[PDB]
Amino acid sequence: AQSKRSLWDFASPHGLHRAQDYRRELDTLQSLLTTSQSSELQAAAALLKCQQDDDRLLQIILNLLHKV
Amino acid sequence: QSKRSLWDFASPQDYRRELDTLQSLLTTSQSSELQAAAALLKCQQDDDRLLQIILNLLHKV
Amino acid sequence: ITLTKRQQEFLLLNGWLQLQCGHAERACILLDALLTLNPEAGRRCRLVALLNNNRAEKEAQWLISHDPLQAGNWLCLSRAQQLNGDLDKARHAYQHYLELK
Amino acid sequence: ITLTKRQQEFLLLNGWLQLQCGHAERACILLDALLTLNPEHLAGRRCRLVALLNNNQERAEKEAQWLISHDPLQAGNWLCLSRAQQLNGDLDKARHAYQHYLELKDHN
Amino acid sequence: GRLGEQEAFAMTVPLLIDVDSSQQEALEAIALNDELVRVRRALYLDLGVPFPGIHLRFNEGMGEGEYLISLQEVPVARGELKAGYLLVRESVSQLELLGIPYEKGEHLLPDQETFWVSVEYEERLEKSQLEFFSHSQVLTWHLSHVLREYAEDFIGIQETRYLLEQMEGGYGELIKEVQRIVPLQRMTEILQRLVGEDISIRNMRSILEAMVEWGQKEKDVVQLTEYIRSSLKRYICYKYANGNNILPAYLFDQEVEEKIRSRVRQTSAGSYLALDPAVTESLLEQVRKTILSQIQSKPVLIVSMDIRRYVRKLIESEYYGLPVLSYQETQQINIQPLGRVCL
Amino acid sequence: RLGEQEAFAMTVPLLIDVDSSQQEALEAIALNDELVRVRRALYLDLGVPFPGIHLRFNEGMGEGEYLISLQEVPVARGELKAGYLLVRESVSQLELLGIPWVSVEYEERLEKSQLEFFSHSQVLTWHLSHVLREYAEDFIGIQETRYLLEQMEGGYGELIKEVQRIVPLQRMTEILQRLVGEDISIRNMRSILEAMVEWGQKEKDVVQLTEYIRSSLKRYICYKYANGNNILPAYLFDQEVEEKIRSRVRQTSAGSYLALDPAVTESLLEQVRKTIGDLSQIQSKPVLIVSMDIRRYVRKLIESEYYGLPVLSYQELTQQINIQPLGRVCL
């Protein structure tokens, strides 16, 4: 109850506009981590590529529909 | 009280999960009573599989 | 073979429903499995199942001579003996149940 | 191979979002990468502790020890330990840690 | 009243709450008659459904702690819990409760984990700030749950007509236009479908404007109600996007959407989605593999509009929580793809 | 007393919830007159009949949290760090590093430097004005259009009676909403109604009719988008791009949306971005000028990125205008 909410509030950080900043940081991080040789950074890079292309698919779907 | 007192004397969604565990437990069995119980459980397990098929076919949206 | 009360309750409820829905054979087999596994509620259910199926007296003797905490143990015996052909002793058992009430 | 503060903030936000969407393991992977690159900030560790608690993993005790040995001024550091100890079976120690957290919250 | 009177007909009460006796005057201390109207009014403000009057009765035929809530003289929520005698309950009991384990016990299933503690432990347990549902709180919680899950039965033709007549002074021409465009039956069915998705009726102006705009173009109830849902873009966005621009998504693959759309079956109204039991089982298995209740942001499924409802009833059986949204339903939203439902 | 049915109440159209710690401290500032003043100014600029504004002081929130909600749904949630003392600056730049939200002690010396000084009322009304301008389409309903028509009955009776018999209320309201969506003022209702009468008998599609009504406001558009002396900056489109866009008009039963191919729109948007060039460094409000039949189709193509840059039709341009082409969008 209260303890679970306190856990989530403790984990919580938060003011960033995101939007364009999200896609720009995604592309920079994916190209930074692609060069890496560590395993943890390899898993992180694959996760970022996954989100980068699921987002590319949703941008394509929004572009494809449009209701003037 | 009549027969109601008799019924009172006899008286006391994880259902499918317990069903599947019990059916696989009793399948290993060898005694006659447990064999009859396992066959009864398989019977009900497949009448339920038929009703799941009926529920899937029956939709209204 | 070993189990816990979790599955035993599933078996108990299924046996009770089958007995209350005139099958009694399915309840008898399920309760036979229950008693063969856990011999320690199910005894009363299988007693009533044998009464409605028609052997019942032998099972009723266990409950009467080892679980004297229930007054219902003298109705089932009566029914069992009325299946066996002892009406006067069944009346005596009914009087015993009335005395224990 | 260092990260920009912008990039560290992106990783923090993504980890928080993954925690906020139940994918505890995905948040753990993101925050583990962030800490392996920049270990300086403990907010990523702070949230990955709760992520590991929700992930059902002794590792939580180690992370709580890090937080207690580097930021012992937050009473929240005593809930995770409690959870870890109640997850690891040491219920009595969890009771003691919870009482300590209550005392520190009363202090705060 | 004699043996010549025909029947003395009487209509069934819409909503009834029958609680046990020995709490007629032992209870009612706190409100018992103001808390109920408060929670009903709050739920209406959250939803907009014109909930009916609440009939409260004390029956001594039952036991000591059994309360039942019945809709139209049919019991819909029973429970043998008047907090025992005074044992208040805990709603989020878990191993967290074993952290400070006061005496506890289980009972009938009202919803989530529930255990009961005595009033002497109440002080030290509230020092731990856990949730404390009293008799009034648990009764009103059950009432609110019943109203939320059965609100479709509170929207009839009479209720919609009352709503329209109450707004005649405000927007007369709008009401006359929506009346001339669509009938009462379609409007009430649309409102019921909207409430079935936890979409609030409260903002009736935009609903009527969307009804006017799209009622001349579409006659199918499903498409019209999907358009009306898409007319509430910002409301849906604020209701689900808890943070600034955070919208959790479980987006569907194009192949899966095409497979779902392949069996719309618009034969005799209804528009039931029957593909094949094996196919729906496989799709549900894929969704389960991709997609737990240990979440806090309430993630939402986002799929193509034309099949949105068809998808919802597909996952309502298991994932009653997870909502389903249409792409048409606003901008400036950061949709976060948690995972593609592959085929 | 559990006998009332529901006590129905309609949702408030516009609500502003501010903290309780400025209920009477922010009173002498005349925020209740500033709000009506800015609303009246916005109406005079646009003509949209904005609703009444309800102002309430809620103590649940703290600090200077203010929220503006349309129909009990928040559309602008701002936090005023300016609550205590910190007056703000809107054109803060690197130049502010040379002479450095600011306190009221710096206000005198900064106004000696003559910068933009938004007080609490000014920032609140700025946010309100932005909300009203970007959400004016939600303030034009059937009831509002009927009120506008009834208000002009004494002035132009026969004109209203004819335009009502020519086009219905729904189409007229949709046309007004589309006009306002491009920041075109409704205020000059006479010419709009005359264009509605003239072109409503010929065209039934909403897009074409509203394009004709836009073209009926040539001089208004010219004055609004050309502050100079008949000089209008333009980013005219090539014939090839216009033909490619027009090739996928897709005029269906409900909506003439131009979904062509995502890659094609991506390439066209890249070409537009390469052409237009800078965004913030550009002044004098350049406008895009394209063929009328696709004007809206072009606008919705660039509304995602270039919300600023307006889109105009060749028909919307009157004569005696020196159109200066800043660059052709090549293919």
Author numbering:
A (entry chain CB): 51 to 63, 68 to 122
B (entry chain DB): 52 to 63, 74 to 122
C (entry chain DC): 3 to 42, 45 to 58, 62 to 108
D (entry chain CC): 3 to 59, 61 to 111
E (entry chain CA): 359 to 649, 652 to 689, 691 to 704
F (entry chain BA): 360 to 459, 474 to 704
From the study:
The assembly crystallized readily and conditions were identical regardless of which YscX construct (YscXfull-length, YscX32, or YscX50) was used. Diffraction measurement of the ternary complex containing YscVC, YscX32, and His6-YscY gave data to a resolution of 4.1 Å (Supplementray Table 1). Two nonamers are stacked upside-down with their membrane-distal sides interacting in an assembly probably lacking biological significance also described by Kuhlen et al.. Instead, 18 binary complexes were placed manually into helical density present outside of the nonameric YscV rings. Each YscX:YscY complex binds to the SD2-SD4 cleft of an individual YscVC protomer. Minor movements are observed at the binding site between YscY and SD4 as well as helix α3 of YscX and SD4 but these do not seem to affect the export gate globally. Our model also establishes that a highly conserved 46RLYP49 motif of YscX binds within the aforementioned SD2-SD4 cleft. The C-terminal α3 helix—which is the extended helix seen in the YscX:YscY structures—is inserted between two YscVC protomers at the cleft formed between two adjacent SD4 (hereafter referred to as SD4–SD4 cleft). This is the major binding interface between YscV and YscX and involves SD3 and SD4 of YscV. Except for a salt bridge formed between D108 of YscX and R701 of YscVC directly at the entry point for the helix, the interaction is largely hydrophobic with most residues involved being highly conserved. Our structure of the ternary complex YscVC:YscX32:YscY exhibits the same open conformation showing that no major domain rearrangements are necessary to accommodate YscXY.
The export gate SctV (YscV in Yersinia) binds substrate:chaperone complexes such as YscX:YscY, which are essential for formation of a functional T3SS. Here, we present structures of the YscX:YscY complex alone and bound to nonameric YscV. YscX binds its chaperone YscY at two distinct sites, resembling the heterotrimeric complex of the T3SS needle subunit with its chaperone and co-chaperone.
